[PDB]
C-alpha cells in the first residue's frame, strides 16, 4: 500500500489508483443527465444547499453562445477549466472569427488535463463536464473524466446514484431521437426523478435546465421557465 | 542657470543659494529653497534639471539618513561626497542619465570644515570656492581677487555682500533674494535672508 500515494508511481498491477480515487471523488457530486435530439441538446442538473436559508449551488454555468457545460466534482478546478474554456472560445473567436467545433475544444481539454496526470506536483482534476454544442454537424453531448478519456455519447449521466438514470437512458435511447424539446426535457427530469430517493419529490428550487438549439442560443433557466417545464408530469408509480 | 555660492573658511563653510524657481519666461516661485540638510554638519546644494533635483534629494538625503540610523554615527563629508560621485558616475552610463550640478559642504571633528565640487560629468574636487552657471564667472573674478585663507566669518559675509552688489549690476537675470547658511563646530545655522532693493 506504500505505492498508493502519488500519480507518477505505477502500480505493480499497472493501475494508477490516483485516477480511480479521482473517479470516486467525481462520484460524490450532484446528479446530472445530458441527452440530445437530432436538433436539440438539453443537459439537466440538480442543485443542493448547505442549509435551508442558504441558496442552492448552481451547476450549469454559461460558457459560450453555443457551448454550455454541466459539472461534478471540485469547484476550483471547475472554475479553472471554465476560465480556460472561455479563453479557448474567445481566442479562436478572435483569430478565425468563427464559433468552434466542439471536438477540437474537448481535445484541448484532454491535452490540458494530461500534464497534471503525468508529472509530479499537481493533482488530477476532479471534474464532471457534460458539454453540449453545435458545430456544422449538429448537437454533441460529450463527457469527460479525470483520466482525460473524453467520451462522446447520445445520453449520459454522472454523479451520485446515476445508475438508475443510465438504465432509464437505456430504455429510452430509442425514443429520444425524434421528439421535440418539451417531452425531451421531461424525459430528462424523468431521469433526474430516479436519481433521487422516492420519499421526496423534485421541487422547483433544486433543478436547472439548459437548452441550446441549432437555431437557439445556450440559455440557463431557474424556476421561472422551469415551472412551465415542471408541469406535464405524473407521480412516480408507487 | 542660477548659481549657489560655497565659500570655505578656516573653521566654517559659507554657503549661499538663491530663492528662484522660474520657468522659461516667468518667475513661478520667489521663495524657493534648494538647501538639503543631510545630517548635523553636512549640507548639499543642487542645480540642474528640476526633475532630477528632487530625485537626488530623495536618494542621497535618505540614504545618508539610512547610514546614520544603521551604524550609529554621522558620515565624514569625504565619504558622502564620494558616495554621491559614485552614484552619478554609475547612473551616467544608462538609458536614464542624471544631469545636475552639485557642490558639497560638510564639517568633521577631525578634518574640520570641508568643501566639495561636482559636475554633470561626476567629478570630485576639493576646492576653496566653486562655480556653476554664469554667476560662476561673475563671482569668481571678485572672489579670487579678494580671498584670504585666514579670513574671518564677518569678512566673508561682507565679501558676499560686495559680490552680490556686483551681481545685481551686470546680469541678464533677476535673482532678487539669496538665502545663506553657515556651518561651525555646532552645526547648521541659518543667517538672515539676503535681499537687495536695487535702485
Amino acid at each position: 500500500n506504500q505505492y498508493d500515494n502519488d500519480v507518477t508511481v505505477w502500480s505493480p498491477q499497472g493501475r494508477i489508483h490516483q485516477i480511480e480515487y479521482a473517479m470516486e471523488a467525481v462520484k460524490q457530486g450532484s446528479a446530472t443527465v445530458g441527452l440530445k435530439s437530432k436538433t436539440h441538446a438539453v443537459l439537466v442538473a440538480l442543485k443542493r444547499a448547505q442549509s435551508e436559508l442558504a441558496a442552492h449551488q448552481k451547476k450549469i454555468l454559461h460558457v459560450d453562445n453555443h457551448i454550455g457545460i454541466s459539472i461534478a466534482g471540485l469547484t476550483a478546478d471547475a472554475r479553472l477549466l471554465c476560465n480556460f474554456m472561455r479563453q479557448e472560445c474567445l481566442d479562436s473567436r478572435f483569430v478565425f472569427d468563427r464559433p468552434l467545433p466542439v471536438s477540437r475544444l474537448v481535445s484541448l481539454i484532454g491535452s490540458k488535463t494530461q500534464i497534471p496526470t503525468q508529472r509530479y506536483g499537481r493533482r488530477p482534476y476532479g471534474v464532471g463536464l457534460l458539454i453540449a454544442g453545435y458545430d456544422d454537424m449538429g448537437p454533441h453531448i460529450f463527457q469527460t473524466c479525470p483520466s482525460a478519456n473524453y467520451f462522446d455519447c447520445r445520453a449520459m449521466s454522472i454523479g451520485a446514484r446515476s445508475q438508475s438514470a443510465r438504465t432509464y437512458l437505456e430504455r429510452h435511447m430509442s425514443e429520444f431521437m425524434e421528439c421535440n424539446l418539451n417531452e425531451l426535457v421531461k424525459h430528462g427530469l424523468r431521469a433526474l426523478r430516479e436519481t433521487l430517493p422516492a420519499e421526496q419529490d423534485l421541487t422547483t428550487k433544486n433543478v436547472s435546465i439548459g437548452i441550446v438549439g441549432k437555431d437557439l442560443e445556450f440559455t440557463i433557466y431557474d424556476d421561472d421557465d422551469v415551472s412551465p417545464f415542471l408541469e406535464g408530469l405524473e407521480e412516480r408509480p408507487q | 542657470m542660477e548659481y549657489l555660492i560655497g565659500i570655505q573658511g578656516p573653521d566654517y563653510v559659507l554657503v549661499a543659494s538663491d530663492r528662484v524657481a522660474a520657468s522659461n519666461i516667468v518667475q513661478m516661485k520667489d521663495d524657493h529653497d534648494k538647501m538639503f540638510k543631510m545630517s548635523e554638519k553636512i549640507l548639499l546644494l543642487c542645480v540642474g534639471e528640476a526633475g532630477d533635483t528632487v530625485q537626488f534629494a530623495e536618494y542621497i538625503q535618505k540614504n545618508v539618513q539610512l547610514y546614520k540610523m544603521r551604524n550609529g554615527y554621522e558620515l565624514s563629508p569625504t565619504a558622502a561626497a564620494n558616495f554621491t560621485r559614485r552614484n552619478l558616475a554609475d547612473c551616467l552610463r544608462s538609458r536614464t542619465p542624471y544631469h545636475v550640478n552639485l557642490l558639497l559642504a560638510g564639517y568633521d571633528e577631525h578634518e574640520g570644515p570641508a568643501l566639495y565640487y561636482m559636475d554633470y560629468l561626476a567629478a570630485l574636487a576639493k576646492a576653496p570656492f566653486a562655480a556653476h552657471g554664469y554667476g560662476a564667472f561673475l563671482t569668481l573674478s571678485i572672489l579670487d581677487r579678494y580671498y584670504t585663507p585666514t579670513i574671518s566669518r564677518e569678512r566673508a559675509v561682507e565679501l558676499l555682500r560686495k559680490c552680490l552688489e556686483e551681481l545685481q549690476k551686470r546680469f541678464i537675470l533677476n535673482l532678487p533674494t539669496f538665502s545663506v547658511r553657515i556651518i561651525d563646530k555646532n552645526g547648521i545655522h541659518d543667517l538672515d535672508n539676503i535681499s537687495f532693493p536695487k535702485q
Binding site: 460558457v63 472561455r86 474567445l90 473567436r93 478572435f94 472569427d97 | -
Partner: protein, 213 residues
C-alpha cells in the same frame, strides 16, 4: 520607407436625443486616389443599447472592434449583466491609453442609452480622452458638419429663437441633409449612408443612398 499609417477617411455622425441615439455614417472605403469599395459600414451594434462607429486607419478599426467585443463578452460572462454606455467609454479610454506610445490613428464615437433611458454620446480622441456631449462629427468631414449642428441643435448665434427639443423625424431629415451637403463637397464621402437608431425597444437600421461619383 514602410509607413505604419494610412488615411482611409470616413465620416461619423452622432446625435444624443431625449430618449434616442442616432449614429450614421457613409460606407466608402478609399485610399489615396482610388476607391476600394462602396460598402463598408463604420457603425457596429454592440448590445441592444450601444452602437459604436470607428473611422481612421481601417485595420485598427477592425482590431479595436474585435477587442471591444471580446471584453464585452468577458464582462457579461463574468458578471451576468451587460455594460452601460459610460462603462464602455471608460474601457475604450483605458485601451487607447494602453497603447499610448504607439497610438491607434482612429477616431471613435460611442452612442447609446444611459440607465435613465436617455441619449448619451461619448466622443473620443486618438489618445483616449472622452466626454459626454450631445453631437459630434468624426472623420475628414468634421469641420463641414460641426457649425451646422451648432446652428440647429444648439441654436447658437441666433436671436429670438426659442429652444424646442429635437424630435426623431426632424433629426432624421437633419442627418439626410447634412450628409447630402457634406457629400457635395467632401471627397471621402458618398454612395450610401448607414443610419442606426437606438430606442428603448431595440436598434433600427436604414440605408439611404447618395450620388454615385
Amino acid at each position: 520607407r514602410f509607413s505604419p499609417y494610412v488615411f482611409n477617411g470616413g465620416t461619423i455622425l452622432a446625435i444624443a436625443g431625449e430618449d434616442f441615439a442616432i449614429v450614421a455614417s457613409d460606407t466608402r472605403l478609399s485610399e489615396g486616389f482610388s476607391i476600394h469599395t462602396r460598402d463598408s459600414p463604420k457603425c457596429y451594434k454592440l448590445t441592444d443599447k450601444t452602437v459604436i462607429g470607428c473611422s481612421g486607419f481601417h485595420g485598427d478599426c477592425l482590431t479595436l472592434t474585435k477587442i471591444i467585443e471580446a471584453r464585452l463578452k468577458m464582462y457579461k460572462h463574468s458578471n451576468n449583466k451587460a455594460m452601460t454606455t459610460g462603462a464602455i467609454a471608460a474601457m475604450l479610454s483605458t485601451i487607447l491609453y494602453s497603447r499610448r506610445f504607439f497610438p491607434y490613428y482612429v477616431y471613435n464615437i460611442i452612442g447609446g442609452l444611459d440607465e435613465e433611458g436617455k441619449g448619451a454620446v461619448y466622443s473620443f480622441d486618438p489618445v483616449g480622452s472622452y466626454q459626454r456631449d450631445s453631437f459630434k462629427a468624426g472623420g475628414s468631414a468634421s469641420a463641414m458638419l460641426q457649425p451646422l449642428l451648432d446652428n440647429q441643435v444648439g441654436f447658437k448665434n441666433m436671436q429670438n429663437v426659442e429652444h424646442v427639443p429635437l424630435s426623431l423625424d426632424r433629426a432624421m431629415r437633419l442627418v439626410k441633409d447634412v450628409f447630402i451637403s457634406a457629400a457635395e463637397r467632401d471627397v471621402y464621402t458618398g454612395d450610401a449612408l448607414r443610419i442606426c437608431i437606438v430606442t428603448k425597444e431595440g436598434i433600427r437600421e436604414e440605408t439611404v443612398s447618395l450620388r454615385k461619383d
